[PDB]
Design an enzyme around this catalytic site. Structure first.
Site, PDB file in Angstrom:
ATOM      1  N   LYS A  50     -14.099  -9.374  -3.656  1.00 53.46           N
ATOM      2  CA  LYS A  50     -14.624  -9.714  -2.337  1.00 53.46           C
ATOM      3  C   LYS A  50     -15.755 -10.733  -2.446  1.00 53.46           C
ATOM      4  CE  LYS A  50     -12.033  -7.281   0.537  1.00 53.46           C
ATOM      5  NZ  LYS A  50     -12.729  -6.179   1.293  1.00 53.46           N
ATOM      6  N   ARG A  76       0.830  -1.198   0.000  1.00 61.57           N
ATOM      7  CA  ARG A  76       0.000   0.000   0.000  1.00 61.57           C
ATOM      8  C   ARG A  76       0.877   1.266   0.000  1.00 61.57           C
ATOM      9  NH1 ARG A  76      -2.154   3.986  -0.345  1.00 61.57           N
ATOM     10  NH2 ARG A  76      -3.977   4.891   0.698  1.00 61.57           N
ATOM     11  N   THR A  93     -17.334  -6.857   2.242  1.00 60.05           N
ATOM     12  CA  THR A  93     -17.740  -5.489   1.928  1.00 60.05           C
ATOM     13  C   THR A  93     -19.255  -5.410   1.725  1.00 60.05           C
ATOM     14  OG1 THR A  93     -17.645  -3.635   0.316  1.00 60.05           O
ATOM     15  CG2 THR A  93     -17.244  -5.808  -0.596  1.00 60.05           C
ATOM     16  N   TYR A 112     -12.624  -4.512  -7.721  1.00 55.22           N
ATOM     17  CA  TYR A 112     -12.346  -4.717  -6.306  1.00 55.22           C
ATOM     18  C   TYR A 112     -13.574  -5.359  -5.620  1.00 55.22           C
ATOM     19  CZ  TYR A 112     -13.342  -3.773  -1.539  1.00 55.22           C
ATOM     20  OH  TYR A 112     -13.833  -4.043  -0.296  1.00 55.22           O
ATOM     21  N   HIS A 113     -14.773  -4.804  -5.801  1.00 53.08           N
ATOM     22  CA  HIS A 113     -15.926  -5.350  -5.086  1.00 53.08           C
ATOM     23  C   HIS A 113     -16.176  -6.792  -5.519  1.00 53.08           C
ATOM     24  CE1 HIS A 113     -16.922  -0.986  -4.318  1.00 53.08           C
ATOM     25  NE2 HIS A 113     -17.292  -1.485  -3.153  1.00 53.08           N
TER      26      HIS A 113
HETATM   27  N1  LIG Z   1     -11.213   1.859   4.352  1.00 54.53           N
HETATM   28  C1  LIG Z   1     -12.487   1.578   4.372  1.00 54.53           C
HETATM   29  O1  LIG Z   1     -13.332   2.525   4.293  1.00 54.53           O
HETATM   30  C2  LIG Z   1     -13.005   0.266   4.422  1.00 54.53           C
HETATM   31  C3  LIG Z   1     -14.483   0.106   4.441  1.00 54.53           C
HETATM   32  C4  LIG Z   1     -14.946  -1.233   4.477  1.00 54.53           C
HETATM   33  C5  LIG Z   1     -14.087  -2.357   4.438  1.00 54.53           C
HETATM   34  N2  LIG Z   1     -12.669  -2.104   4.446  1.00 54.53           N
HETATM   35  C6  LIG Z   1     -11.878  -3.331   4.218  1.00 54.53           C
HETATM   36  O2  LIG Z   1     -10.860  -3.437   5.196  1.00 54.53           O
HETATM   37  C7  LIG Z   1      -9.645  -4.012   4.610  1.00 54.53           C
HETATM   38  C8  LIG Z   1      -8.536  -3.084   4.882  1.00 54.53           C
HETATM   39  O3  LIG Z   1      -8.853  -1.770   4.323  1.00 54.53           O
HETATM   40  P1  LIG Z   1      -7.893  -0.553   4.622  1.00 54.53           P
HETATM   41  O4  LIG Z   1      -8.628   0.703   4.302  1.00 54.53           O
HETATM   42  O5  LIG Z   1      -7.273  -0.713   5.954  1.00 54.53           O
HETATM   43  O6  LIG Z   1      -6.720  -0.758   3.482  1.00 54.53           O
HETATM   44  P2  LIG Z   1      -5.261  -0.380   3.410  1.00 54.53           P
HETATM   45  O7  LIG Z   1      -4.886  -0.339   1.941  1.00 54.53           O
HETATM   46  O8  LIG Z   1      -4.985   0.852   4.298  1.00 54.53           O
HETATM   47  O9  LIG Z   1      -4.619  -1.628   4.147  1.00 54.53           O
HETATM   48  C9  LIG Z   1      -4.409  -2.922   3.467  1.00 54.53           C
HETATM   49  C10 LIG Z   1      -3.089  -3.396   3.907  1.00 54.53           C
HETATM   50  O10 LIG Z   1      -2.931  -4.764   3.325  1.00 54.53           O
HETATM   51  C11 LIG Z   1      -1.635  -4.905   2.885  1.00 54.53           C
HETATM   52  N3  LIG Z   1      -1.625  -5.933   1.790  1.00 54.53           N
HETATM   53  C12 LIG Z   1      -2.314  -5.847   0.592  1.00 54.53           C
HETATM   54  N4  LIG Z   1      -2.047  -6.928  -0.157  1.00 54.53           N
HETATM   55  C13 LIG Z   1      -1.191  -7.736   0.608  1.00 54.53           C
HETATM   56  C14 LIG Z   1      -0.547  -8.937   0.382  1.00 54.53           C
HETATM   57  N5  LIG Z   1      -0.638  -9.621  -0.817  1.00 54.53           N
HETATM   58  N6  LIG Z   1       0.251  -9.473   1.341  1.00 54.53           N
HETATM   59  C15 LIG Z   1       0.397  -8.781   2.558  1.00 54.53           C
HETATM   60  N7  LIG Z   1      -0.172  -7.599   2.839  1.00 54.53           N
HETATM   61  C16 LIG Z   1      -0.956  -7.106   1.838  1.00 54.53           C
HETATM   62  C17 LIG Z   1      -1.282  -3.466   2.368  1.00 54.53           C
HETATM   63  O11 LIG Z   1       0.113  -3.292   2.209  1.00 54.53           O
HETATM   64  C18 LIG Z   1      -1.899  -2.575   3.463  1.00 54.53           C
HETATM   65  O12 LIG Z   1      -1.016  -2.273   4.545  1.00 54.53           O
HETATM   66  C19 LIG Z   1      -9.989  -4.245   3.145  1.00 54.53           C
HETATM   67  O13 LIG Z   1     -10.556  -5.559   2.995  1.00 54.53           O
HETATM   68  C20 LIG Z   1     -11.080  -3.255   2.907  1.00 54.53           C
HETATM   69  O14 LIG Z   1     -11.921  -3.546   1.767  1.00 54.53           O
HETATM   70  C21 LIG Z   1     -12.144  -0.874   4.437  1.00 54.53           C
HETATM   71  O1  LIG Z   2     -15.848  12.240  -3.363  1.00 57.37           O
HETATM   72  C1  LIG Z   2     -16.675  11.354  -3.461  1.00 57.37           C
HETATM   73  C2  LIG Z   2     -16.380   9.954  -3.166  1.00 57.37           C
HETATM   74  C3  LIG Z   2     -17.352   9.027  -3.289  1.00 57.37           C
HETATM   75  N1  LIG Z   2     -18.628   9.327  -3.741  1.00 57.37           N
HETATM   76  C4  LIG Z   2     -19.651   8.250  -3.830  1.00 57.37           C
HETATM   77  O2  LIG Z   2     -19.796   7.753  -2.486  1.00 57.37           O
HETATM   78  C5  LIG Z   2     -20.071   6.321  -2.511  1.00 57.37           C
HETATM   79  C6  LIG Z   2     -19.031   5.629  -1.611  1.00 57.37           C
HETATM   80  O3  LIG Z   2     -17.788   5.654  -2.331  1.00 57.37           O
HETATM   81  P1  LIG Z   2     -16.444   5.549  -1.529  1.00 57.37           P
HETATM   82  O4  LIG Z   2     -16.517   6.270  -0.266  1.00 57.37           O
HETATM   83  O5  LIG Z   2     -15.354   5.797  -2.467  1.00 57.37           O
HETATM   84  O6  LIG Z   2     -16.395   4.008  -1.109  1.00 57.37           O
HETATM   85  P2  LIG Z   2     -16.330   2.627  -1.944  1.00 57.37           P
HETATM   86  O7  LIG Z   2     -15.723   2.799  -3.263  1.00 57.37           O
HETATM   87  O8  LIG Z   2     -17.660   1.985  -1.883  1.00 57.37           O
HETATM   88  O9  LIG Z   2     -15.236   1.809  -1.084  1.00 57.37           O
HETATM   89  C7  LIG Z   2     -14.944   1.891   0.278  1.00 57.37           C
HETATM   90  O10 LIG Z   2     -16.016   1.386   1.069  1.00 57.37           O
HETATM   91  C8  LIG Z   2     -16.346   0.019   0.709  1.00 57.37           C
HETATM   92  C9  LIG Z   2     -17.433  -0.365   1.699  1.00 57.37           C
HETATM   93  O11 LIG Z   2     -18.025  -1.521   1.096  1.00 57.37           O
HETATM   94  C10 LIG Z   2     -15.154  -0.904   0.917  1.00 57.37           C
HETATM   95  O12 LIG Z   2     -15.570  -2.206   0.455  1.00 57.37           O
HETATM   96  C11 LIG Z   2     -13.947  -0.416   0.107  1.00 57.37           C
HETATM   97  O13 LIG Z   2     -12.798  -1.227   0.395  1.00 57.37           O
HETATM   98  C12 LIG Z   2     -13.691   1.061   0.482  1.00 57.37           C
HETATM   99  O14 LIG Z   2     -12.638   1.593  -0.312  1.00 57.37           O
HETATM  100  C13 LIG Z   2     -20.062   5.967  -3.976  1.00 57.37           C
HETATM  101  O15 LIG Z   2     -21.402   5.974  -4.500  1.00 57.37           O
HETATM  102  C14 LIG Z   2     -19.245   7.041  -4.681  1.00 57.37           C
HETATM  103  O16 LIG Z   2     -19.434   7.181  -6.084  1.00 57.37           O
HETATM  104  C15 LIG Z   2     -18.977  10.665  -4.076  1.00 57.37           C
HETATM  105  O17 LIG Z   2     -20.099  10.962  -4.491  1.00 57.37           O
HETATM  106  N2  LIG Z   2     -17.965  11.574  -3.902  1.00 57.37           N
END
Ligand SMILES: NC(=O)c1ccc[n+]([C@@H]2O[C@H](COP(=O)([O-])OP(=O)(O)OC[C@H]3O[C@@H](n4cnc5c(N)ncnc54)[C@H](O)[C@@H]3O)[C@@H](O)[C@H]2O)c1
Ligand SMILES: O=c1ccn([C@@H]2O[C@H](COP(=O)(O)OP(=O)(O)O[C@H]3O[C@H](CO)[C@@H](O)[C@H](O)[C@H]3O)[C@@H](O)[C@H]2O)c(=O)[nH]1
Ligand SMILES: NC(=O)c1ccc[n+]([C@@H]2O[C@H](COP(=O)([O-])OP(=O)(O)OC[C@H]3O[C@@H](n4cnc5c(N)ncnc54)[C@H](O)[C@@H]3O)[C@@H](O)[C@H]2O)c1
Ligand SMILES: O=c1ccn([C@@H]2O[C@H](COP(=O)(O)OP(=O)(O)O[C@H]3O[C@H](CO)[C@@H](O)[C@H](O)[C@H]3O)[C@@H](O)[C@H]2O)c(=O)[nH]1
Lengths: 392, 392
Positions: free
Chosen positions: B186, B36, B145, B182-183
């Site tokens: 999952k 990342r 997700t 990505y979605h």
């Molecule tokens: N950020 C959000 O809003 C959000 C919302 C819902 C779900 N999640 C889920 O939570 C999880 C983590 O999200 P995040 O925002 O912390 O992401 P992030 O990118 O900050 O963290 C992911 C981490 O995984 C590590 N990684 C990726 N591929 C790897 C591999 N092959 N081997 C070892 N390490 C690896 C990356 O280096 C990074 O440190 C994801 O499944 C994401 O979809 C996040």
């Molecule tokens: O500036 C912005 C950003 C997003 N959106 C909309 O807001 C919604 C949410 O988008 P975003 O906040 O980018 O989240 P996701 O792309 O859905 O993804 C995040 O939230 C998901 C929750 O399911 C996780 O699975 C993913 O890993 C995480 O990156 C979507 O309809 C976007 O098109 C806007 O209108 N304006």
């Protein structure tokens, strides 16, 4: 013309399909890395029928009919190769048979489960990107699998189901419940393709095919070098073809578990007819059509009885045996899968008959000397799969 | 103590979770290849908050509390590395955050779509095989997700739905309709894990989490070197966090399309609480539990209004703008997702409040000088994605 790229065209369904489409006046190419032949060498397996090389197969078709099937030998996971082939041939339709299709193979060990999913899922993504980038109007005819649906307690529909939940109604993708790493890879492919139809306007037809039986088609019988493969081993062989070979060599029919496992089946002659129908009546832009491609449902016990009866007419005194099931699956279950879309488009099915079984059993008897009986019994356990790469 | 392996523990959700579990007296390790951080360098992105190296982060936690979080640096797609780490640490639970999680990143070009699916799907398969082979009773807590469900015209359930179809009833996996590569990855992971629960007796909990907001947790605020990352760019930033940073620097809030897109959201403080609850109340052998992990639903327009109001209290005169949507998604849709399982297990939620927004906006104002405004607007189109590898 109409141009069709047959990915996986050296394989069982693909070779029969490529010749049929060429006979029907489509311009055809085959894209295949021939890895299926390598797996036979690696696992110590061999087709019942001796088959010719892909080059000799194509040369013989040309010598007989004058028609040239173009050949591109490479891995579709290598995008440079796939892109060059697409740009060289310029297909109007792509039929995708080029995947690791064996459930047992996908359960041999970690490396084979991972290979199955990587090869299948990434190869299919590459096909979608090639269509988008080089020929966006190209229709993708994808081989999915009836196994995507599993064995739920409700009727199985053709890809979609209209549900009323908490007072609202919607038509949604049918819930998927696959039972091997191979079947799972097809579920992943179908979900990926459906997304691209909506996001990019791709036109696609998912053919969720039942188990295929038979070895003869009109084209492959025209000369010995055109002969198709017939697998009988426990890794790539499938139920009916396996039972016919077992009957011919005097091996008791291998019924796994209780034998109530029920599935859709169809003759290889219908596989080629259905693919041609899907190509001739294409999906519209943005449409993801799903067809359940089989002609009749049978339980394993029903197949065993049919083969026993047909074998009796040939003096084979067929016996049956119960094999502890290597698979995790329901051995008694409800099964009522819908299959009307292809019939509505004109399918004229070859239902399983006494004639077909007699011909297939006689065929197996003719080549019984080539049968390696050591490969008949299953040795791949769904539960005992490990991480060490296995040598068979 | 109980031993927990946090895969992806250097990331946004993972780092906060690792510290929380360590504070709660679990023995913790982090498994992460730090890719990342490489993507930030490659794409020209940077966190709002300056963050320390993973080694300095862990050393600071040890200096403050005396607790040692073990670190294994490698790619979980390399099974030799994953297996050695599992055998060295011997986890009782594995929390899997280690995936490419950005929808825009997965849509940049073919190579990034393929990387996303390969990395995510194969990494997860390797985790399942490591649990089966080296510690079969280990509970897998997987981050799925809320996006797996898409936006159907019926209520969204927590993983399963009981349907009556043609006079028969069954409880089936909820239909999946993902809207990015990505979605989709999952969805593939969830289907793979469900199969292994049935075939191998794996115990797993899929946490289908909503969009996370916030940067502070009790542990990460204990010292500057423990600070979490806060993404605001259009590739890794998410809606609410992005709007707060935009308000702070005087950029109009970027509402994509109509703004009716509705999703579940939750505070990062609740992410760590929910993971701990799933670990403390494990799934049973063979059970695939699914929890919808969010605390409140909001449309993008609602978020824009809340940020505007909070910004007014800080003298920021927040404006809004309509950005032609880079994504293919419904901009007005029904949305009623169920979320009661975690509450039944004791979740005490931190609902979005005036206090949280004031704190987050003040935080963004404090670091406004670090904001690269060139990264605010989206430049990745779902429809125009191509095959050439892009340089940003
Ligand atoms: N950020 C959000 O809003 C959000 C919302 C819902 C779900 N999640 C889920 O939570 C999880 C983590 O999200 P995040 O925002 O912390 O992401 P992030 O990118 O900050 O963290 C992911 C981490 O995984 C590590 N990684 C990726 N591929 C790897 C591999 N092959 N081997 C070892 N390490 C690896 C990356 O280096 C990074 O440190 C994801 O499944 C994401 O979809 C996040
Ligand atoms: O500036 C912005 C950003 C997003 N959106 C909309 O807001 C919604 C949410 O988008 P975003 O906040 O980018 O989240 P996701 O792309 O859905 O993804 C995040 O939230 C998901 C929750 O399911 C996780 O699975 C993913 O890993 C995480 O990156 C979507 O309809 C976007 O098109 C806007 O209108 N304006
Ligand atoms: N055989 C059946 O009973 C049956 C039943 C239903 C559906 N199908 C489906 O039909 C398709 C073909 O099945 P089959 O029995 O003909 O299989 P097969 O193994 O005989 O043929 C597959 C062919 O694809 C090629 N291939 C595999 N990976 C490739 C790659 N990366 N690049 C290029 N070529 C590649 C192989 O070398 C082989 O020639 C599969 O999707 C299968 O699931 C088959
Ligand atoms: O000797 C045998 C072989 C199979 N079976 C059972 O018969 C059913 C069908 O199994 P099989 O014929 O091996 O087919 P599948 O493994 O389902 O796979 C084939 O048929 C699928 C149709 O969906 C395709 O997707 C696959 O690519 C193709 O290999 C299963 O319940 C088996 O356990 C037996 O009882 N005895």
């Amino acid at each position: 013309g109409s141009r069709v790229m047959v990915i996986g065209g050296d394989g069982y369904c693909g070779w029969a399909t490529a010749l049929h489409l060429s006979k029907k006046n489509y311009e055809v190419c085959i894209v295949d890395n021939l890895v299926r032949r390598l797996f036979d060498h690696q696992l110590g397996l061999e087709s019942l029928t001796p088959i010719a090389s892909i080059h000799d197969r194509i040369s013989r078709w040309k010598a007989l009919t004058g028609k040239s099937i173009e050949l591109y030998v490479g891995d579709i996971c290598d995008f440079e190769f796939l892109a060059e082939s697409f740009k060289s041939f310029e297909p109007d339709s792509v039929v995708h048979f080029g995947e690791q299709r064996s459930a047992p193979y996908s359960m041999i060990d970690r490396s084979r489960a991972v290979y199955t999913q990587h090869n299948n899922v990434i190869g299919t993504l590459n096909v979608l990107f090639a269509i988008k980038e080089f020929g966006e109007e190209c229709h993708l005819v994808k081989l999915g699998t009836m196994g995507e649906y599993g064995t739920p307690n409700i009727d199985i529909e053709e890809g979609y189901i209209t549900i009323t939940h908490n007072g609202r109604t919607d038509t949604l993708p049918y819930p998927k419940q696959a039972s091997s790493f191979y079947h799972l890879s097809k579920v992943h492919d179908s979900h990926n393709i459906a997304f691209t139809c909506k996001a990019w306007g791709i036109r696609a037809t998912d053919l969720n095919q039942g188990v295929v039986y038979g070895v003869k088609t009109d084209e492959t019988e025209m000369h010995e070098e055109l002969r198709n493969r017939l697998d009988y081993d426990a890794v790539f062989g499938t139920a009916l073809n396996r039972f016919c070979v077992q009957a011919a060599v005097g091996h008791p029919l291998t019924v796994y578990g209780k034998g109530g496992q029920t599935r859709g089946y169809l003759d290889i002659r219908d596989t080629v007819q259905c693919v041609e129908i899907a190509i001739a009546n294409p999906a519209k832009a943005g449409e993801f059509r799903v067809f359940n491609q089989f002609t009749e449902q049978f339980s394993v016990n029903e197949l065993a009885s049919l083969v026993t009866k047909a074998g009796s007419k040939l003096g084979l005194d067929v016996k049956k045996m119960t094999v502890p099931n290597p698979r995790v699956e329901a051995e008694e279950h409800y099964y009522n899968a819908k299959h009307t879309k292809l019939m509505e488009l004109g399918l004229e099915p070859h239902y399983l008959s006494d004639s077909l079984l007699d011909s297939l059993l006689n065929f197996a008897v003719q080549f019984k000397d080539r049968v390696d009986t050591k490969q008949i019994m299953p040795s791949v356990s769904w539960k005992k799969i490990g991480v060490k790469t296995k040598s068979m």
